[PDB]
């Protein structure tokens, strides 16, 4: 889901 990408990014 495109809408989940910023989360994975934020957890980095």
């Amino acid at each position, epitope marked *: *889901n495109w*809408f989940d*990408i*910023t989360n994975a990014l934020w957890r980095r």
Partner: antibody
Amino acid sequence: QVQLVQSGAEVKRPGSSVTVSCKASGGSFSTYALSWVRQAPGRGLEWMGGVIPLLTITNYAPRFQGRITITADRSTSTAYLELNSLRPEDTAVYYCAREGTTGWGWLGKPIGAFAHWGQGTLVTVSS
Amino acid sequence: EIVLTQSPGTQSLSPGERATLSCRASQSVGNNKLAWYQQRPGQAPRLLIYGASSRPSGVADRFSGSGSGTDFTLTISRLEPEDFAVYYCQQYGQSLSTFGQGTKVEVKR
């Protein structure tokens, strides 16, 4: 506190192209998803697509594919919507919207939903 | 291509009453990623609920959201004068995000 300011109303001839800007201030620009949503007079909302500035990863709705282009200028915290081959049916108020963050502040975990919206830009396509 | 159906289109109530708005998805919504927006005429939408039941800071506590799967609901314990507007649901459980057609909450007199 995130504020999105958009460019002014535009009048375009059928077949032309239009570019709408959205300037953001507050919070982090490059790490949050910025989408464009439109609304024809008297109709409902319709998500068109968005972009993740940092990764430049775009996502467009199928009915706009190959006619739409969304980009982001991280130097200016400005996002852009470019819609080509304009038709009268494209007449609408276009809004940019950034996803919100959990809890207070604007740096927490993203939430996907659109917490921040621009004032909107009326785009009239007619001859 | 998830389709969200909000019914009824119009709800006729009054200040002080409880309102219940439903949104049905043509297929299950991933991770319950459904949001609700309030929109007043000529104004930009305002986020009320996200994740189906989460309410951001700044949103009146009278707004509540529940549900999961294909059936979601927006509840307003008691209506205030400014709450009469159009409410829209949105699913972002797939890259192709979509909005419901909206439900109008008007004042019955």
